[PDB]
Amino acid sequence: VIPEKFQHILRVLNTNIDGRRKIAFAITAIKGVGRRYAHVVLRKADIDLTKRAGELTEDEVERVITIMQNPRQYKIPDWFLNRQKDVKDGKYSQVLANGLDNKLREDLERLKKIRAHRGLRHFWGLRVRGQHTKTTGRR
Amino acid sequence: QPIKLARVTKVLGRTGSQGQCTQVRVEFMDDTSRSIIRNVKGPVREGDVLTLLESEREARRL
Amino acid sequence: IRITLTSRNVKSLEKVCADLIRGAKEKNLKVKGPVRMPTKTLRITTRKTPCGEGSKTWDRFQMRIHKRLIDLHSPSEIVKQITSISIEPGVEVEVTI
Amino acid sequence: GKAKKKKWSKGKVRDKLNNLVLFDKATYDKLCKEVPNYKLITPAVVSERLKIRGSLARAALQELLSKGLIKLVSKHRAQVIYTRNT
Amino acid sequence: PGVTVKDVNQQEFVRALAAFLKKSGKLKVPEWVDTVKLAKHKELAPYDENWFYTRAASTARHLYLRGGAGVGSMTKIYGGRQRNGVMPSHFSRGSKSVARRVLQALEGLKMVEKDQDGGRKLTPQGQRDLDRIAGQVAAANKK
Amino acid sequence: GRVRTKTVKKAARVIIEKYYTRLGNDFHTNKRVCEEIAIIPSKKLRNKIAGYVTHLMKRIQRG
Amino acid sequence: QSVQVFGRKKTATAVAHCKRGNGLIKVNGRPLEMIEPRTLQYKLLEPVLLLGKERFAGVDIRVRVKGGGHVAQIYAIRQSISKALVAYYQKYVDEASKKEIKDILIQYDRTLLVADPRRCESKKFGGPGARARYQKSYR
Amino acid sequence: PDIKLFGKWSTDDVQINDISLQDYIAVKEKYAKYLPHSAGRYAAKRFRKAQCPIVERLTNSMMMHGRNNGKKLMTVRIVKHAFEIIHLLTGENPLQVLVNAIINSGPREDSTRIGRAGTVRRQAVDVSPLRRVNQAIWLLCTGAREAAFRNIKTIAECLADELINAAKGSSNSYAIKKKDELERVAKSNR
RNA sequence: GAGGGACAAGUGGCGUUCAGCCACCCGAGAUUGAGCAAUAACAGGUCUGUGAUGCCCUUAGAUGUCCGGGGCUGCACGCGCGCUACACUGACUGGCUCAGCGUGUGCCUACCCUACGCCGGCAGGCGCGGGUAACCCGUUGAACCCCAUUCGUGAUGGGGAUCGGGGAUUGCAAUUAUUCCCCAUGAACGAGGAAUUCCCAGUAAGUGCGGGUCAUAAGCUUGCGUUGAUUAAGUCCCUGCCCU
Ligand SMILES: [Mg+2]
Ligand SMILES: [Mg+2]
Ligand SMILES: [Mg+2]
Ligand SMILES: [Mg+2]
Ligand SMILES: [Mg+2]
Ligand SMILES: [Mg+2]
């Protein structure tokens, strides 16, 4: 009946801290993994939802990290990933927690060279989709 | 320190800065037919048994 | 074969209905009833004002479109004989064979 | 920017209180010992009094229901109603 | 005796029928629904693993109720309250892919006859199947 | 509620002044008598006038 | 033998066809024990759990409702049964028992024979509801 | 032919131990109904509200605060769970302790303004018994709501605990807390 | 469609002969909600609705009119009407079950309502049919609500603002506004001080739908439906009004 397994908090990708309430909602704590993607990776890994994060095998953790680093070998088509076709490489992949901030830095680094007003309003204290900025953006 | 009860015989009128209390000359159940006038706020009819915490007062009418 | 009497107002509707039933009783035709239709209403709400001063005071304009349908199986000569009716101008007549 | 609010009401119940995810050895042993002593087996009392979460409380109550020690009166949306005979 | 599906409560009927359709093996589930499919316009996936058989049982119950519904009609039958966030909620509709999937699967398993003017309607084989399943569910209820 | 208009009371006084023997002490008969002897288009006004006519009949029957 | 009694809830109408038989109440092909809320499985049975069992076994009534709300349909079924028994006791059974059972129904409840004269009022052109107004702006 | 019963209940021999609240609680046989969700049309006459049953009044005062403003089926279910919890707590019938809570759940007098257009002294005056029933039901449902706010306990469980701690003079319920808050101020301004 | 039914009529009491008031019953109701709404004024708004208009201004490089961009959306700020939350009466998932106003085409001049089947996960595309309308959308299988699972008091799965990549639709053109959909990023917010707005029975509030602009287009407004409170039915104390 699973009395107690010696597992409290895991460590994934050197920055993220896994929780203790579930397994999908602890993979949700990884940046770049949110509401639906964690449950999709769990359903590909075929793990029962009643089991916690402290009741799961480290080999299965490595299998989940394998699905993270290469999802396209089995399943999960190109629409569901975070990073779509516009890469400057044209590669269909899922971003990491350390990788997402680096991709945002590359986005802003090329938008500063483009000098588009989207990058200009992000560099200044303005909003891109903030069409009205009377009440929006105070303090 | 007695706590007595009393049923309403008649209703005189309504009184207050808001017009909320009702001056009620109630009656005495536990004794003979004697008369005190009480200020009762809230709805009241003729025959409502009222809880009295002090049977020593007397309100005045105008 | 059906005949639709669509009127602007209820008084001319009932007058042309009574006149048509009075003209249809004496002939040898199985006359169906003046089938009542639901009254249509075009509700229009208006600001009442060109400039926005005062409370939001709105109009409510309506019409009462009234309609009746009857069924009269008859030859076309008898239908064209019944068609000639001294009628109120607020009543429109449609025929369908 | 600045943080300003018009009311000041701090000091809640207990300071981000911890709560057990899975039942321990001695904790579940104490549960099995004094679970006949409670007359009204409700998951809120089992969770708040005995340092249990709601999910582990419902899991333990369904486990004792499958064991057949506490009789269910009427189960519903969120008011699980259990009672022990005698 | 005579058992009607309205005589028995539904939350026993669909809960048994989602397993009797597993026992009969009447499901088509090609590739994308094997992978993952979300709800109407939502953020999560259904929980109980037999949700395909649950949708098929609800489709069978609704085609027993109303004969002549279609893909869009059954999509409006399912329906949805689309919570948008700051913008208030409205009534959105479900997906048409499962709505044609379940009808195509039951047509391949010989339970849906097409209408010449509308869509799905009942078959005598599916009538016998649902009537015997409702009878054994009523027998399990009374026993 | 019965604080009726002067034209209503004046019409009912004209009715009770001209035609008394045609009126009785029943509302459903006095209304039909008043609508046989007078012209009132509004049915609420018919009921109002006939009620005050019955009230005047109950006053005349006493004193 | 065949008397159909109608509804008259606020936006709910229950046609109740009566018939002599062996004990049946049909609500849109669905029997008496099935009520669309689970909470109201004492209010709809008030003609059943108060008036006896031989009346239920003697009178068969099918009920078809074209209501608009659930509570409106429940009270429409209740009023349609409680008036269809009165109509069947007018058309078949003697008045010496009809008046007794009518006095029992009246002294139990008012809404068994008398309908509710309550319809929703029109929304006003000044405020958001039938009585309310919007918020003012003073200084 | 059977007795009028809520669920599997009896609704009999529920005795009001005192006067000044008699003929206002509908617990008797002449006003016994099967569910609180009844045809509530008691807002026309000034004195037809007292014929409403106190369980229906408790449901109507329980449904408040916008997010639950309505849902009589839900609040009748909540009061059903509360009566079931009170019954399973060593018997001590929920209808009887509900009547006892209406009797002993708050004010016996209140202080308010007097006229004279002068100094407001807030003289302690009498209170209507209907107003005592109203304020008792209001304090019980408010205490149950703020006891079941932000916890694991439910509305029904805290309402059952509130009715038990109000029927028993333990001075640990919010109805008795506001009873203290009203009667100490009433004795001070007496 | 016509007619009926309700008028304080019948009883008791209080009131002056009166005028009238309170409770009962028969009744569906002992009266619902709107429209119109007097004399005389505001030195209230509209010349930016009118080929409705007086005076002045411009009339040939035009203050007339077309075409191509920007703008009214621009933000160190304060204010008003509103929507969503601050969770467990709840959030998620699955099942069940109910409507009413009202709208819809080849127009006194350019345009919809969409049913059925197939494909795509999605917004959507394709073939075909009906409706100038109680015919078809449509028996508007609506949301809350009715049951079962998950969550467990943790800024948490409540909240979805902000931001990045992509996919479809109207439009000739959406980037410094369309809109919608998929993933991801997940702040403040712990029921709000001084002050203040609305409301007495199908009422406020919760919740959804139809019309107006519409092409894409509602968080506004007008109407309609579902569930449906607590408590007054009194007063002139704050404010304002009517008559001496
Ligand atoms: Mg303001
Ligand atoms: Mg609110
Ligand atoms: Mg000219
Ligand atoms: Mg502007
Ligand atoms: Mg400006
Ligand atoms: Mg405004």
Ligand SMILES: [Mg+2]
């Ligand atoms: Mg959320």
Ligand SMILES: [Mg+2]
């Ligand atoms: Mg969060």
Ligand SMILES: [Mg+2]
């Ligand atoms: Mg809401």
Ligand SMILES: [Mg+2]
């Ligand atoms: Mg449109």
Ligand SMILES: [Mg+2]
């Ligand atoms: Mg629109």
Ligand SMILES: [Mg+2]
């Ligand atoms: Mg606008």
